[PDB]
Design a protein around this ligand. Structure first.
Ligand SMILES: *[C@@H]1O[C@H](CO)[C@@H](O[C@@H]2O[C@H](CO)[C@@H](O)[C@H](O)[C@H]2NC(C)=O)[C@H](O)[C@H]1NC(C)=O
Ligand SMILES: *[C@@H]1O[C@H](CO)[C@@H](O[C@@H]2O[C@H](CO)[C@@H](O)[C@H](O)[C@H]2NC(C)=O)[C@H](O)[C@H]1NC(C)=O
Ligand code: SRO
Ligand code: SRO
Ligand code: SRO
Ligand code: SRO
Ligand code: SRO
Lengths: 385, 385, 385, 385, 385
């Protein structure tokens, strides 16, 4: 007789698969688990879910599947289909849709009754995401493995291995994605929602950090590009009537661009992300450039103004060294029309050189409000790097 | 003999799982339920559905699964697979797609015949959404648990616990999302669509309110930004020929922006939301700014107009203090060409100072139609806060 | 003995569930159905499908499930699982994907053999949509219930109730959506695709009408907004050099807006919708405004033109009352250069006042081509309302 | 005894459903099929798939389900569940996802052993799409029905009916969609991937043609609209300084529009579609309009140029008839400043009339490069119509 | 007796399908596989997955399904349902969702016990994508077939055929898509995650290359189009006041276009793709064109400047040959006002001809920075072609 199916006839003849396998019912069946995390497939932030592929394994002690290796040609391990034995109902408290993993149809059984079960499982799980510092963020998502029905008296959950070996496990993990795990942190916890019920659970805090190197060329590269167009835009002469149309076109291009980057961050009501506050301050610096162009074109215009006041013309003089026959009465009438002509040219000429020395020094103030304000960026960048 | 599977052989030997378990058929099997709501996953408003994760439990009385704890070593609870016993067909009247929850394969049975069943269930349910006051809204969505086939004579539905304990249940609930539940309100109701049929149902009015703090920085922050660009835009001199091109560019940027925010609110035919009516009034204030610029550039232009009328020049004078040899005949011909030259300059100069004192006071009217109209915003904001 | 499972042992002992239950095989099993329509979930027009939630019920006569209420304690109704009896294969000819409804696991049986079956069913069904008059449209979608395999000799289909009661059934229906049903119209029809096969079917013409009140504020509110910007745009003086840049900017904004509304209507080759033809006529009215601005700026320009012809200057005069020492030769040379100077100013001044009296009356023609053309809108609106 | 389930007890008592039913194993079981195509649901071109709803039927000869109509009250047809008999594994070589069709749970059996099986089946099938002539295209997609495991020796595939009747079958087909089938073309073919294996297959070449009447109002209606704006745009005078800003705005609007229509056509590397080549030639005609405006504004400008050369002024004269006391020395100084003034006006006046007669004839060349080039469109349209 | 179901009664009478079929348990069951790849359906790069349709087959040796062809009329092959025998649990380590393939319900068995199993299987598999050289890229995605539970002692994996025949297999493969496979490379590998467990696996490195011919007309055709608009844009005279509005409009159109092409490439943190670095250098060349227009309009303007310095006027002269009665005092006053008039015209005239000879030679430098920089494109194109 072949000895490998003589054994399965001995185990599964009178085996009843609907009974929690134990001889004294007062003790629990202590399962023992661990995770080996393979990949982080996607982090959906607007929906606050997280899909993950995990290699997973359990063992528990089945007191009805015991034998001796003699009378069976020293068989010490054996494979049984999963649908023909008892199996616990351990699942996750935090799933959203779990139908993506196939069922492994086989389990091992040892000669002491140690049934061990290997299966892959994908987990579209719901964990709250903190998105405050957007390119430089670590996440803290839980994976609470628990028995759904059975209490402490029936099913208790411990680990396969030591909790140090779970923390530093990068044995299989797919790198060169968007995320990168630091550690998987296990913790036993006894859960109770009311009196007279207590449930075992095993949380796995998987922490991951975003690799930020892509988002420099999608959130900072056009923003610094829209600044060097603004720096060269002050070198238009304000008398052209084309400088204000330059600045409103630039702010138009900035405004369309900010729409594009708004859709990524979620509607989580803990506030705004920290980088999104900067694009408001980046946008308000364009308005100070837009309010500076309107002021000097209001100040310098062919409008037939009044005289420049010498109280400020002396103030502009100090800053200029810092930042820069009755035929006589008839023919007298024709020169008087030209007396008024060139003099009103010189009135607008007096307002003219005022609007350039206020153009230069306010361009220096704008250049120091950019160049000294960029040092604040790299020092917050280098320390958090 | 081990006593835990001796009991399951005693219960499930001649048990027929297709019969509603009762000895006198004239009495119903009164199930009893409650919900423990875990999260609100998404509220799709354009489709008017609502997905929700709920911890759920039932018990009913099975008169065929009774035993005595003696002859079984004082066993008082026991686990049976769900597919091997009777189970009611309680489901929801308002689902759209329910396939996302796994089946819990186990139930408890007590020694009196009290079968109790724990299961998670996700509910893409269809509830009508009222979206009138958009950032500040409470919702009222039903969850009508009922038996689909059985009538009052067969299955009646009551609650597990007191209806006060269901209302104030925040024991497990995931916060820091978009929504926040106030209460879950149960109510028994007897349903009847015709004569000779009556059905038990248990409605659960779950009310939730949106946390509005995110939508201030996505529906009010660019709208107030497009006003301070409009306030500074009046400081262009109207003689530039660049002011009307400024105002139409601004209204262009506003018009593109209103497209972006239109896609959120649904096509529900109860009317428009209340905040969407304000963006029309916000848009019509830009037209009054756009109609004011066209009027003064029509009024002030190098066009060789007629004289300003002294009926309104005196009216502008009052508001200015409030808001602000035959050689003689040949040579006489050359001055007359300059007589006509400077005089038509002074005609346009007379229309010139009119268009600035009407520019200033209409800018004060526009500034008071903004600043006093913003007080209406925060008082409606603070009371509803 | 308990009498409720003594009955199910009597019915389902030798019952064979694979046989169409009848004693004389020459007669059909006449099923009888009706629908109770609950909601219209979505109408996808680009794909021409329609999803609908329907409460549904059948009964047929099973000649093998008969008993007498005596010997069973006057039991007259009983519940049997659906998978343990015969059930017809009645389904829809027009489905696209039907997997969204759960299976009701129970049926009633009466003491005469009247098995009745209640189930919900969702129907992503394919019906052709007529989209000609877009906001004001009724639809006519079929729901052809038929047996897929069995012919007239085996399965015939009739109704539960009278066909008048199906038509006026609004007992349960979720209102305050986008659609609103007028009636559900049943009609028996015998189907035959060839010789020697005839099939019963029961069509249900469900007609629904769109509530159009939302699409007034998404298809007419910006279109009338882009007209009042065009009406005020004629009050620019044509000498500014900023009026043509105003009109092309407006047509730019209109052109981008028409892209946004194009994606809703499908690629159904019965033609264009009727409202989409109007937006072409709405767009061509902007070109007549754009061709009118180009004509007067071509007519009025500092170009050193020729004289205005008195054949049309008299025509403009009639419409103006309707719509509105050798020192002498040397010094004679300097006045002749000013003779040519002011005269060519008066030549452009003669073309100047022509271009305003043609500006005013063509603005009246444009104002009457708008105001009288809007009366055509509301009269087609009020009658179809 | 009722005779309809006495027959099913006679057929399915010792019937083994895992054996290919034949008495001499050396002959094949010749199935016979046909398709009745109901609708073409969608053609996804970027993914190159095709979903189709097909009414489908098979018959094969089962030598174990034979009887005589006597001893059974002249029963000649009978219904058996599909899961209780043998059924071939005929499926499609070209599917992508086939889970959308329900299983018909019944088959007919005749008294000779002719089992016939009716089922609907939806087919998201993968066929390569040729998209060269985009609005006027026929497709040629295969549907290769074959047995997946069994060879020629076990399962052979023929047709139900004559192959002429399959070709001209429009008995049920949903029209008024986007597509329209010409014919379904069957062809038997013996498949072999290596030595010692040969497989029967039955290809069904379904050819469909797009109804092009919708895409005239979405690919040609705005393109001809952006030409009549270009035709009227030449009537701006080139001295305005607003004509180049008109032409770049138009090319901006064209460039945004071409983005919108690019997303439809796939990334199939057989080249570009033929209509997409025309929009490049449509775009390059705008550049010749844009290069013509830049040339005449470079030629006509207040720049203090040199003299016009009489070598080309005579050439412009020919085309103009085709396409169109020491007081004397002091006072002599003041006329010499006006000698230089009006003469440089006449130098720019000489370049002025040159730039209009080159404006008119190059506008005639552009008008003949449009009007004669539109005749090429309708002749390629009418023949392919 | 018919001999084909007499054989299946002999094999499957006492067959236990839950036992790994072997007589001596110490030897493994060596399965043997290969793949025949049919199509590459989609490559999702933002999600880094890959869907593939593969024809697949296995055989293993079943020691319990042996017979002799005599006593069964020389039957040497036979078909058994898959659910009635043992089958290994060979699956893929790298799947994401595998539910899209149907189950083939049949297997062959030979008279020696060689069970062979044919099935199609679709594989949304997760492989890391290298996207550095975007249009010209080869991919290297693994397909690791392994037994999930069984070790080396139970299941070992080898190939059907020689590993050379797998490499050059294009027998069935759907061409004329986006991708094109070079080879499928098999490699045996023994896997071990810890001590005391060793697993067989069979990697299949399928390498595919993108056909780049479509992306020339979607990533290079508008980019070279936005250069010839820039080349003709220098032929505007800088005195128009319309040239800077031309250049900012062009950069606006370029900036919107770069948004459109950004969404394809993923967020993989290995850096940026190589073609995306070029569009930054393509964008910075427009800024040098935009900084050149601002410089000459700052240099040439009616501003009443000072004199041009003869240190650079001589430098411009060298490059111009390379790149190009008390009535007397009263009447003396009127000429002095015209002395100042024409002289300040000649001051701006002196700056005028400077700004054209710097316009021409900087246009030659820009033309050589384009034409010589395009030779770098085609040489990198032709070698990698
Ligand atoms: C949600 O809506 C339901 C009905 O639409 C409200 O239920 C009503 O509650 C009042 C107060 O208890 C009862 O008098 C009515 O009989 C109830 N109506 C029905 C149809 O049962 C419910 O109060 C609403 N929720 C909130 C928070 O107001
Ligand atoms: C669709 O394509 C197939 C092949 O790609 C065409 O089938 C060919 O038809 C001709 C004419 O009957 C035969 O001579 C060839 O042998 C067929 N080819 C194959 C591979 O069998 C088919 O004709 C095409 N459809 C149309 C409408 O032309
Ligand atoms: N083929 C993968 C077998 C395997 C090896 N080590 C494992 C660890 C966990 C697990 O679920 C599975 C495994
Ligand atoms: N593991 C969660 C068990 C659990 C504890 N309390 C519960 C309440 C309801 C429920 O369905 C389930 C539970
Ligand atoms: N719980 C809903 C039971 C029900 C009451 N009336 C009905 C009518 C039809 C139907 O399918 C079902 C019903
Ligand atoms: N109810 C549709 C029955 C039917 C009638 N003719 C048919 C032809 C083919 C098929 O699969 C089915 C049919
Ligand atoms: N009908 C396809 C049968 C077939 C022929 N050759 C094959 C090779 C592999 C495979 O899985 C299947 C096949």
């Amino acid at each position: 007789q072949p000895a490998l199916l003589r054994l399965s006839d001995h185990l599964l003849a009178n085996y009843k698969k609907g009974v929690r396998p134990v001889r004294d019912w007062r003790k629990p069946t202590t399962v023992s688990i661990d995770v080996i995390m393979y990949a982080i497939l996607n982090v959906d932030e607007k929906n606050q879910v997280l899909t993950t592929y995990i290699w997973y394994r359990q063992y528990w002690t089945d007191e009805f599947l015991q034998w001796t290796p003699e009378d069976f040609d020293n068989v010490t391990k054996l494979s049984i289909p999963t649908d023909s034995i008892w199996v616990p109902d351990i699942l996750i408290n935090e799933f959203v849709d779990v139908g993506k993993s196939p069922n492994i149809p086989y389990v091992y059984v040892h000669h002491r009754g140690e049934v061990q079960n290997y299966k892959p499982l994908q987990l579209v799980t719901a964990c709250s995401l903190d998105i405050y510092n957007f390119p430089f963020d670590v996440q803290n998502c839980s994976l609470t493995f628990t028995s759904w029905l059975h209490t402490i008296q029936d099913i208790n959950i411990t680990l396969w291995r030591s909790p140090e070996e779970v923390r530093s496990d990068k044995s299989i993990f797919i790198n060169q994605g968007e995320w990168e795990l630091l550690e998987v942190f296990p913790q036993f916890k006894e859960f109770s929602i009311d009196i007279s019920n207590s449930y075992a659970e095993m949380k796995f805090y998987v922490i991951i950090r975003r690799r930020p190197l892509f988002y420099a060329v999608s959130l900072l590269l056009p923003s610094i590009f829209l600044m060097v167009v603004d720096i060269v835009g002050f070198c238009l002469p304000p008398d052209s009537g084309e400088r204000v149309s330059f600045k409103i076109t630039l702010l138009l291009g900035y405004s369309v661009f900010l729409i594009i980057v708004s859709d990524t961050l979620p509607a989580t009501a803990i506030g705004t992300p920290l980088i999104g506050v900067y694009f408001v301050v980046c946008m308000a610096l364009l308005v100070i450039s837009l309010a500076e162009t309107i002021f000097i074109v209001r100040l310098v215009h062919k409008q037939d103004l009044q005289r420049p006041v010498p109280d400020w013309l002396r103030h502009l003089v100090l800053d200029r060294i810092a930042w820069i026959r009755g035929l006589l009465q008839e023919l007298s009438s024709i020169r008087h029309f030209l007396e008024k002509r060139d003099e009103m040219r010189e009135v607008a000429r007096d307002w003219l050189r005022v609007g350039y020395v206020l153009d230069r020094l306010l361009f220096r103030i704008y250049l120091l409000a950019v160049l000294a304000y960029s040092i604040t960026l790299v020092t917050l960048w280098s320390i958090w790097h």
